[PDB]
Symmetry: C3
């Protein structure tokens, strides 16, 4: 049995639309924990991370809420590192994707050999010197990369940070809205990725075969899955901050996660950018939440083909 | 020319939502028969099967309307067996999927070597001892299997029944909502299937190549296609009793059926679970009916690439 | 750099629903030209082709508005031939697909070795003697084919015409609504095509590999892409004259065009059948226009994976 540890993170200072704050909330009332237990899972919810307010948090150049983002992540990392040390998989129900910084950081403290699968319509690899918005939920990857150890200036609240992954340890799946500076970083650091073009060309089947062998070619190792809800198409996950048409299918979302589970190597999972306050209708919110939950359960065993426990039925 | 024989079956006692009753009706007024004739088809409609009411039909353990379901099927089988003996393909326009019991039963009486392709989001293989709802439209396959000759008790109205197919003679396509007991039966009886996971992995192209070679590997034989409208995604066939998201695409539905036609071996076709009374809007009903009809015509020659009769145009 | 030349063509006499007239208009106010320039493109808009009215244009047998269609095309050809001679790619923002006659005709005058990719739900290959509607937007291909040099009578306004392509120089992608006479012409002239059946079987990835090697097997040559908006599914391009469900996906539409751009051989592009007056809602119009624009930019470099100019970021 692969055991889980819920980590609610109602943070939103990584982007403008604050609705993401109460995202861990809408997921739990959906019955996520219950459904996980409803499965062969052993679940322990560590509660929502109370991120005290940091009123005095002016901009740093163009970067917004740097101390608030850096604090919420430095805290989360400490928690992530706690559950992983308690023999469990970290399930971070988030607000915005800036939390990844702390989530992957903590996971690494325990399993430094980890590999990352980043499902997003975006690469979130902009730097304070490349960002054009200042919103830190589109810059987390730039802080975790060792290669970028030089082009990222010191941001208030990110002193505690120390790049924990190489360019050859992360795979992107779903990309379809990448900046020019971001693309440049990809080709340069030789980052592995499967944009929607490659998904259309290859099929989600081969794309998963290739990403997993890429990550587990030489050796098996803890897998961290960072799932940004906007990776999927808006017709499935409409209630999110920055939607891009031409996204991953419901089925493709499930394939992604069913295959990861079958690897038996999932140790870290992030479920970010779900914002109910942006759904134009009550059903759009429900649609988004149900999809999020569904992708979650697939990571932990729920397969569309069927489930049966070892007992003579 | 492969000739057809319409068999309307306005039955619904296989499940609670009775709207399925008047399903053969909404299909005919759509012009199905007409459109079939509008093709290279030779069509003969044997009329709707009048299933007299059986007021005194209390439950048998948990199983509901057992005598009503058993009667409607024992009758249909007698009809199916009639058209097939009259050199035609049986087209059963149904209500609920419990009718399959009689439809496949009758077809076998004529062609005992038949093979079955079961397109459904469900396996409908629960037994009276495993069913958790008691609705017989989710138990028909359990009654047709020879291997299960032992774990199915005697149900009032199903005495006439005698299992007519082995586990290696049926292929499922579309599965995405299977019970634990049902999954167990699959793995145990080694039943061939392509759930949505495999469809996503392989593609509907290879899935059809593999199911057909599986069924026709050793020898060619009469093919019975049991098509449950919920096999397709609810965005295409919304007006159905038990919808499951992440279903088969419109195109995939057509591919399935175009390939079956091209085999030249189609002898039995079921079109079930269409319930106009469940469509939330007039257009949802139309959408579902048009899709049903479309899948029907593809089984009998209508190809998206084009059609041309042997004449110098 | 591959340079572009905008050619607005507000023509509609190729079909009944005149809304297509003001199609080049809705595309420009969308910012198409701007966005093209916003890219690495060198754009020059030759303005909209003013197609004077030809009041006295009675039917020719069954063919409607023959002099109006023939005139608007003979003019466009003269323009197309002009930009191509001015070292640019022809971008024809159209109304109805009958304009292809003149668009491909002019392009050929400059590059007679050109190859055509025809993205449509239809083949538009009916002849005045086969057409059953008389609308010339469903007959343009029949006028450009050298093999059909015999079965097409003289239509008022098409004297200037001289078939400029062989059956082995055109590839169709997207077909799903073909007449019997049209299918006959395909099989007979041995025309290469990938209907939705083949797309479902092979995947848009292989379909593009096969069409490009088919067209560029022996030698590289100028590529003309005739994109009829109805080639895509109505859920993406609803505001069009003759919509057919089961069409090409948004993603597939982009794959088509991204691969064509990567060939570096695009010389001619048509964007037809966009009719805002048929969108049932303001958003349906927007959805259709944005999709059209998006397919356009992909033809000229915009890739979902990312873009970066040769400069040390
Ligand atoms: Mn994103
Ligand atoms: Mn993100
Ligand atoms: Mn079903
Ligand atoms: Mn069923
Ligand atoms: Mn068309
Ligand atoms: Mn067309
Ligand atoms: Zn952002
Ligand atoms: Zn049921
Ligand atoms: Zn037309």
């Amino acid at each position: 049995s692969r055991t889980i540890g819920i980590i609610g993170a109602p943070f939103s200072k990584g982007q403008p639309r604050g609705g993401v704050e109460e995202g861990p909330t809408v997921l739990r009332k959906a019955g996520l924990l219950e459904k996980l237990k409803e499965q062969e899972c052993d679940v322990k919810d560590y509660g929502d991370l109370p991120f005290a307010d940091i009123p005095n948090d002016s901009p740093f150049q163009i970067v917004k809420n740097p101390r608030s983002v850096g604090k919420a992540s430095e805290q989360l990392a400490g928690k992530v590192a706690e559950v992983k040390k308690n023999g469990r998989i970290s399930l971070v129900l988030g607000g915005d994707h800036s939390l990844a910084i702390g989530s992957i950081s903590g996971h690494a403290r325990v399993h430094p050999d980890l590999g990352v699968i980043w499902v997003d319509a975006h690469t979130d690899i902009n730097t304070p010197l490349t960002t054009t918005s200042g919103n830190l939920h589109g810059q987390p990857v730039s802080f975790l990369l060792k290669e970028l150890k030089g082009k990222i200036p010191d941001v208030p609240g990110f002193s505690w940070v120390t790049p924990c992954i190489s360019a050859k340890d992360i795979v992107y799946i779903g990309l379809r809205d990448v900046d020019p500076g971001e693309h440049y970083i990809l080709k340069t650091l030789g980052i592995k990725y499967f944009s929607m073009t490659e998904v259309d060309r290859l099929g989600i089947g081969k794309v998963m075969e290739e990403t997993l062998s890429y990550l587990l070619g030489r050796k098996k190792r803890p897998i961290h899955l960072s799932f940004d809800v906007d990776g999927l198409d808006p017709s499935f996950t409409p209630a999110t901050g920055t939607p891009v048409v031409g996204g991953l299918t419901y089925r493709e979302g499930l394939y992604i996660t069913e295959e990861i589970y079958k690897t038996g190597l999932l140790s870290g999972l992030d479920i970010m950018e779900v914002n109910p306050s942006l759904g134009k209708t009550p059903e759009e919110v429900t649609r988004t939440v149900n999809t999020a939950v569904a992708i979650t359960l697939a990571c932990f065993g729920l397969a569309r083909e069927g489930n049966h426990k070892p007992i003579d039925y």
